[PDB]
């Protein structure tokens with residue numbers, strides 16, 4: 001319940017922040033800049049999943 | 061154990077596929093193309109989290 | 121160049137494996153369990169055909185600057201009602217009750233299909249029709265049908281609940297993929313859209329079936345077997 | 346323009362809230378629980394200062410086409426040993442055993458700091474030093490220290506295990522962020538790196554503390570309180 005909401009909300013929050021970086025990079029017009037922001041977002045989300053999973057396993 | 065591995069492995073698999081799309085877009089040189097692939101990856105990963113969470117709750 | 125076909129083939133393989141597993145598991149099924157195994161085979165079997173067709177590059181429809189897959193929606197129209205049928209059998213529904221849930225389900229599937237093939241904001245009106253029908257279906261599954269299942273054995277009720285939860289929760293995700301995917305605002309690319317659906321389809325069909333298969337032995341033991 | 350400072354301020358606020366919560370929770374703590382509450386206050390309090398400093402734009406070091414934050418590593422060097430100390434107190438360690446784990450921990454923290462400030466592949470040798478020391482620390486926490494904790498009450502052993510699991514599992518993620526982040530191959534941008542660390546720091550410090558606070562009452566009841 002509250003945990004799914006917590007991790008889901010945070011993931012969305014992280015996504016928003018990641019999205020912000022991608023959008024800002026796109027504004028420049030440099031495909032390379034966007035790719036760097038995108039790779040960071042993908043890897044960051046994968047790591048975030050690791051943190052959430054670890055937290056759940058450590059508490060539940 | 062096996063579930064964390066399963067969802068973690070799949071998430072990494074999805075990330076790889078998403079990364080592939082971003083890289084391919086970057087090769088074109090169009091910042092807009094990269095942004096579209098990046099937004100898709102971020103939203104896709106968030107949805108993937110929803111699926112994994114739903115699956116766990118439905119089985120466990 | 122096109123990992124799309126690769127994803128479709130993977131979906132086809134997964135559905136095929138499931139189809140064969142269910143068929144084999146029901147080889148010596150009793151006259152009471154028979155319909156269940158046959159239904160599972162039909163669910164995954166039809167899905168397997170749809171994926172093979174798409175993997176072969178057939179049924180691809182480049183609607184207004186977007187790409188939709190006709191076989192996907194045809195598959196849903198024909199397989200989701202079999203899933204509802206399976207759940208209805210566990211709940212112990214009569215002809216009337218079955219007709220109600222199958223009608224609602226069909227409205228959902230038809231709405232998504234029509235909406236996917238329709239350009240313009242009108243597709244959102246069709247989506248709305250499906251969304252409302254879906255809420256009605258969810259109500260029946262969690263309400264009337266759950267009460268009906270409660271009149272069966274503990275094993276049947278337990279299985280119904282497990283499969284009902286998997287269905288309600290995961291089916292609820294499809295409309296979001298539709299809205300965010302190519303059919304809707306197209307924020308998700310075809311590849312990402314297809315990957316997510318392949319995952320969901322395998323779980324809602326093959327996963328669904330394996331859970332039932334895992335409960336089979338316990339259900340037989342309940343009747344003194 | 347710079348949500349970095351915003352993330353640092355959020356980390357500062359979270360650490361401050363924790364610091365105040367722990368301080369208040371230990372207002373009427375006994376002479377036996379005292380050290381525990383004081384330690385928690387020190388853990389989150391120092392972290393709070395580090396975040397405020399970074400939020401104010403101080404300690405930012407633009408190492409070779411990358412950005413590292415000195416206060417982050419200084420914070421770790423000073424706070425992680427307090428976390429180990431807290432765990433060691435629950436386990437009931439003696440001076441010698443404490444010295445061993447604190448030494449290992451310091452090697453880890455110092456290695457990461459030096460590596461972050463060092464350009465070239467040499468930083469990976471420093472990372473290696475920290476990684477090996479970390480495995481030694483994990484061994485002590487799961488082995489010798491767990492056996493020591495097993496000689497305490499069930500409540501203490503239970504708390505130790507819960508906090509030890511949280512620590513081992515989450516601490517193991519930091520090296521991956523270091524390797525993939527600015528210090529290493531720089532695949533993660535400063536913003537993403539900082540966001541992930543803010544989350545981890547709050548859990549490993551504030552979450553860690555709240556779990557201990559939640560166990561306090563039960564531990565008192567064990568002694569007949």
Ligand SMILES: *C/C=C(C)/C=C/C=C(C)/C=C/C1=C(C)CCCC1(C)C
Pocket residue numbers: 167196199200203228229231232233246247250251254291292294295298320321324325
């Ligand atoms: C194997 C395929 C399955 C179980 C497909 C399930 C699909 C749904 C539950 C789709 C639902 C939709 C809505 C509720 C609104 C309209 C759009 C749809 C068709 C995506």
Ligand SMILES: *C/C=C(C)/C=C/C=C(C)/C=C/C1=C(C)CCCC1(C)C
Pocket residue numbers: 392421424425428453454456457458471472475476479516517519520523545546549550
């Ligand atoms: C509040 C801060 C905490 C609990 C920080 C924990 C940090 C670590 C466990 C860092 C570990 C590292 C390694 C194992 C290898 C070298 C690089 C480090 C310092 C990132």
Ligand SMILES: CCCCCCCCO[C@@H]1O[C@H](CO)[C@@H](O)[C@H](O)[C@H]1O
Pocket residue numbers: 152153156157160209276332333335336339343
């Ligand atoms: C996929 C394999 C799972 C089989 C679960 C079926 C067990 C249901 O139980 C069966 O339900 C029938 C209702 O049509 C009754 O007529 C049977 O007597 C009863 O045993």
Ligand SMILES: CCCCCCCCO[C@@H]1O[C@H](CO)[C@@H](O)[C@H](O)[C@H]1O
Pocket residue numbers: 377378381382385434501557558560561564568
């Ligand atoms: C953060 C609040 C949690 C407090 C947990 C502390 C309970 C530990 O228990 C205490 O350990 C001491 C060892 O130094 C003993 O001397 C005390 O007698 C014993 O009660």
